[PDB]
Design an enzyme around this catalytic site. Structure first.
Site, PDB file in Angstrom:
ATOM      1  N   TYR A  65      -4.544  14.024  -3.123  1.00 44.24           N
ATOM      2  CA  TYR A  65      -5.095  13.327  -2.223  1.00 44.24           C
ATOM      3  C   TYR A  65      -6.333  14.022  -1.208  1.00 44.24           C
ATOM      4  CZ  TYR A  65      -4.304   9.737   1.554  1.00 44.24           C
ATOM      5  OH  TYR A  65      -4.363   8.686   2.260  1.00 44.24           O
ATOM      6  N   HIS A 120       0.924  -1.155   0.066  1.00 46.62           N
ATOM      7  CA  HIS A 120      -0.093   0.021  -0.060  1.00 46.62           C
ATOM      8  C   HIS A 120       0.898   1.325   0.111  1.00 46.62           C
ATOM      9  CE1 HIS A 120      -3.629   2.273   1.548  1.00 46.62           C
ATOM     10  NE2 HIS A 120      -2.751   3.277   1.583  1.00 46.62           N
ATOM     11  N   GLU A 121       1.760   1.214   0.948  1.00 43.05           N
ATOM     12  CA  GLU A 121       2.667   2.581   1.096  1.00 43.05           C
ATOM     13  C   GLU A 121       3.649   2.576  -0.173  1.00 43.05           C
ATOM     14  OE1 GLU A 121       1.549   4.389   3.207  1.00 43.05           O
ATOM     15  OE2 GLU A 121       0.781   2.556   4.419  1.00 43.05           O
ATOM     16  N   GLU A 128      -6.296   6.162  -2.735  1.00 41.51           N
ATOM     17  CA  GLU A 128      -6.276   5.083  -1.479  1.00 41.51           C
ATOM     18  C   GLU A 128      -6.628   3.743  -2.144  1.00 41.51           C
ATOM     19  OE1 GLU A 128      -5.760   4.563   1.705  1.00 41.51           O
ATOM     20  OE2 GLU A 128      -4.486   6.410   1.232  1.00 41.51           O
ATOM     21  N   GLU A 181      -0.068  -9.091  -2.044  1.00 39.76           N
ATOM     22  CA  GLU A 181      -0.307 -10.196  -1.051  1.00 39.76           C
ATOM     23  C   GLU A 181      -0.678 -11.446  -1.806  1.00 39.76           C
ATOM     24  OE1 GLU A 181      -2.528  -9.020   2.693  1.00 39.76           O
ATOM     25  OE2 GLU A 181      -3.555 -10.906   2.515  1.00 39.76           O
ATOM     26  N   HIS A 217       1.637   4.186  -3.018  1.00 39.54           N
ATOM     27  CA  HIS A 217       1.600   5.753  -2.969  1.00 39.54           C
ATOM     28  C   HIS A 217       2.578   6.173  -3.922  1.00 39.54           C
ATOM     29  CE1 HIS A 217      -2.083   6.417  -0.797  1.00 39.54           C
ATOM     30  NE2 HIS A 217      -1.691   5.887   0.496  1.00 39.54           N
ATOM     31  N   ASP A 249     -10.843  13.500   6.907  1.00 41.66           N
ATOM     32  CA  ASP A 249     -10.126  12.484   6.287  1.00 41.66           C
ATOM     33  C   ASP A 249      -9.688  12.975   4.999  1.00 41.66           C
ATOM     34  OD1 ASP A 249      -8.855  10.199   5.907  1.00 41.66           O
ATOM     35  OD2 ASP A 249     -10.654   8.966   5.239  1.00 41.66           O
ATOM     36  N   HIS A 273     -10.132   7.473   2.792  1.00 43.21           N
ATOM     37  CA  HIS A 273     -10.002   6.141   3.641  1.00 43.21           C
ATOM     38  C   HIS A 273     -11.329   5.579   3.684  1.00 43.21           C
ATOM     39  CE1 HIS A 273      -5.895   7.714   4.733  1.00 43.21           C
ATOM     40  NE2 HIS A 273      -5.385   6.637   4.277  1.00 43.21           N
TER      41      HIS A 273
HETATM   42  C1  LIG Z   1      -2.532   0.596   5.317  1.00 44.22           C
HETATM   43  C2  LIG Z   1      -2.682   1.141   6.609  1.00 44.22           C
HETATM   44  C3  LIG Z   1      -2.171   0.261   7.763  1.00 44.22           C
HETATM   45  C4  LIG Z   1      -2.015   2.539   6.648  1.00 44.22           C
HETATM   46  C5  LIG Z   1      -2.566   3.552   5.636  1.00 44.22           C
HETATM   47  N1  LIG Z   1      -1.634   4.824   5.796  1.00 44.22           N
HETATM   48  P1  LIG Z   1      -1.740   5.785   4.251  1.00 44.22           P
HETATM   49  O1  LIG Z   1      -3.247   5.711   3.657  1.00 44.22           O
HETATM   50  O2  LIG Z   1      -0.666   5.380   3.247  1.00 44.22           O
HETATM   51  C6  LIG Z   1      -1.524   7.568   4.803  1.00 44.22           C
HETATM   52  C7  LIG Z   1      -0.518   7.714   6.021  1.00 44.22           C
HETATM   53  C8  LIG Z   1      -0.488   8.962   6.636  1.00 44.22           C
HETATM   54  C9  LIG Z   1       0.346   9.300   7.926  1.00 44.22           C
HETATM   55  C10 LIG Z   1       0.323  10.589   8.207  1.00 44.22           C
HETATM   56  C11 LIG Z   1      -0.240  11.691   7.718  1.00 44.22           C
HETATM   57  C12 LIG Z   1      -1.025  11.610   6.477  1.00 44.22           C
HETATM   58  C13 LIG Z   1      -1.136  10.266   6.009  1.00 44.22           C
HETATM   59  N2  LIG Z   1      -1.282   8.534   3.563  1.00 44.22           N
HETATM   60  C14 LIG Z   1      -0.131   8.300   3.120  1.00 44.22           C
HETATM   61  O3  LIG Z   1       0.883   7.748   3.262  1.00 44.22           O
HETATM   62  O4  LIG Z   1      -0.338   9.228   1.840  1.00 44.22           O
HETATM   63  C15 LIG Z   1       0.909   8.942   1.050  1.00 44.22           C
HETATM   64  C16 LIG Z   1       0.454  10.181  -0.195  1.00 44.22           C
HETATM   65  C17 LIG Z   1      -0.702  10.249  -0.629  1.00 44.22           C
HETATM   66  C18 LIG Z   1      -0.897  10.987  -1.486  1.00 44.22           C
HETATM   67  C19 LIG Z   1       0.088  12.104  -2.296  1.00 44.22           C
HETATM   68  C20 LIG Z   1       1.472  11.752  -1.589  1.00 44.22           C
HETATM   69  C21 LIG Z   1       1.681  10.765  -0.545  1.00 44.22           C
HETATM   70  C22 LIG Z   1      -4.056   3.704   6.374  1.00 44.22           C
HETATM   71  O5  LIG Z   1      -4.852   3.263   5.648  1.00 44.22           O
HETATM   72  N3  LIG Z   1      -3.951   4.735   7.292  1.00 44.22           N
HETATM   73  C23 LIG Z   1      -5.375   5.059   7.846  1.00 44.22           C
HETATM   74  C24 LIG Z   1      -5.149   4.213   9.162  1.00 44.22           C
HETATM   75  C25 LIG Z   1      -5.505   6.346   8.226  1.00 44.22           C
HETATM   76  O6  LIG Z   1      -4.574   7.231   8.146  1.00 44.22           O
HETATM   77  O7  LIG Z   1      -6.684   6.805   8.249  1.00 44.22           O
HETATM   78 CA   LIG Z   2      -4.794  -8.511   3.734  1.00 41.06          CA
HETATM   79 CA   LIG Z   3      -3.719 -12.067   4.771  1.00 43.06          CA
HETATM   80 ZN   LIG Z   4      -2.903   5.254   2.055  1.00 41.78          ZN
END
Ligand SMILES: CC(C)C[C@H](NP(=O)(O)[C@@H](Cc1ccccc1)NC(=O)OCc1ccccc1)C(=O)N[C@@H](C)C(=O)O
Ligand SMILES: [Ca+2]
Ligand SMILES: [Ca+2]
Ligand SMILES: [Zn+2]
Ligand SMILES: [Ca+2]
Ligand SMILES: [Ca+2]
Ligand SMILES: [Cs+]
Ligand SMILES: [Cs+]
Length: 316
Positions: free
Chosen positions: A157, A142-143, A166, A177, A146, A226, A231
């Site tokens: 975003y 996922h990360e 997302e 996975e 991005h 959000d 999300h």
């Molecule tokens: C899969 C889950 C375990 C982790 C996942 N984190 P993520 O969506 O990757 C999020 C992290 C973040 C942390 C701190 C501040 C802002 C954002 N965004 C993020 O990395 O943007 C990257 C980006 C996007 C667009 C443009 C440039 C860069 C997630 O679902 N988190 C939920 C819980 C939530 O935060 O509600």
């Molecule tokens: Ca899974």
């Molecule tokens: Ca699994």
């Molecule tokens: Zn994300």
């Protein structure tokens, strides 16, 4: 660092043993030279300065509790690199073998993971909502996805483009996975979420509504939390992707499934050739239809199934 490529062994967050590609120069570093221009994993040491220090180890054995999040961030970055290269002929996130950097042990009790514009970052969790988040292969992918999005479609975003951003990360996180083929599912984060609760996950692609996330456009969130629900409204697109791959009848609309591999081809082409920073859900439908037409032909089942899936989630 300059050194010689080596192979260490360690245990990940869930206690599983795996080999990791390291580099030896006085210490053994978490630097994998076998992929692109390298995969590098760093220790943030419970602070928020990034990246921290390139992970160094005296003996090339990574079995300490403190090592486990680094082992998994490093290994699963390798799997994700392999997926994009072997399946989509894409060399790292920028298509030109950019070095992949990750930091673990970010902050204290940090219940999240992110791409900061330049690298991946993983909290350890607080032991209640999450355990160290690099333990989830879907989370790591996922990360890194991005980063792929930021170098390709560039989806802003917030609001619908952000919910597509997302969903793209959840879709490819799930496809990675399945690629690794260890307990694969259409749930997000199940391996690291809520250690005291079995059978749950952060999000579900097969049934987003099990957590109150929408599974139809008429249930989309329209408020400001959000980033306008990125999300939350991702569930609408995650559900459509799930239906394209697996089929089903959803709100009375039947979808003939075409399988994960074709889902990945269609969405990868949409992401890299058709989506733009401001694409909304309707424009994603059009991009997926055109991508399926390019790959399989206008009269194909694959095109018909893409239309059925977006119909089922209320996106025209
Ligand atoms: C899969 C889950 C375990 C982790 C996942 N984190 P993520 O969506 O990757 C999020 C992290 C973040 C942390 C701190 C501040 C802002 C954002 N965004 C993020 O990395 O943007 C990257 C980006 C996007 C667009 C443009 C440039 C860069 C997630 O679902 N988190 C939920 C819980 C939530 O935060 O509600
Ligand atoms: Ca899974
Ligand atoms: Ca699994
Ligand atoms: Zn994300
Ligand atoms: Ca050691
Ligand atoms: Ca759980
Ligand atoms: Cs949840
Ligand atoms: Cs909004």
């Amino acid at each position: 660092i300059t050194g010689t490529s080596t192979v260490g062994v360690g245990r990940g967050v869930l206690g599983d043993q795996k080999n990791i590609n390291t580099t030896y120069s006085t210490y053994y570093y978490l630097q994998d030279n076998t992929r692109g221009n390298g995969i590098f994993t760093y220790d943030a040491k419970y602070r928020t300065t990034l990246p921290g220090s390139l992970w160094a180890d005296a003996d090339n054995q990574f079995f300490a509790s403190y090592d486990a999040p680094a082992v998994d961030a490093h290994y699963y970055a390798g799997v994700t690199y392999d997926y994009y290269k072997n399946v989509h002929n894409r060399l790292s996130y920028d298509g030109n073998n950019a070095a992949i950097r990750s930091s673990v042990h970010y902050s204290q009790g940090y219940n999240n993971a992110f791409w900061n514009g330049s690298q991946m970052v993983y909290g350890d969790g607080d032991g209640q909502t999450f355990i160290p988040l690099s333990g989830g292969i879907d989370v790591v992918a996922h990360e890194l996805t991005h980063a792929v999005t930021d170098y390709t479609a560039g989806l802003i975003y917030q609001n619908e483009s952000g919910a597509i951003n997302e969903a793209i990360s959840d879709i490819f996180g799930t496809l990675v996975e399945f690629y690794a083929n260890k307990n694969p599912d259409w749930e997000i984060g199940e391996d690291v979420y809520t250690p005291g609760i079995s059978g749950d996950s952060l999000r579900s692609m097969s049934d987003p509504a099990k957590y109150g996330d929408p599974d139809h456009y008429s249930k989309r969130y329209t408020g400001t939390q959000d980033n306008g629900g990125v999300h939350i409204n991702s569930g609408i697109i995650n559900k459509a992707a799930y239906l394209i791959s697996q089929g089903g009848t959803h709100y009375g609309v039947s979808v003939v499934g075409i399988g994960r591999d074709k889902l990945g081809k269609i969405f990868y082409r949409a992401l890299t050739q058709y989506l733009t920073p401001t694409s909304n859900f309707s424009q994603l439908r059009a991009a997926a239809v055109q991508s399926a037409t390019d790959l399989y032909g206008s009269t194909s089942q694959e095109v018909a199934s893409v239309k059925q899936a977006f119909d089922a989630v209320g996106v025209k």
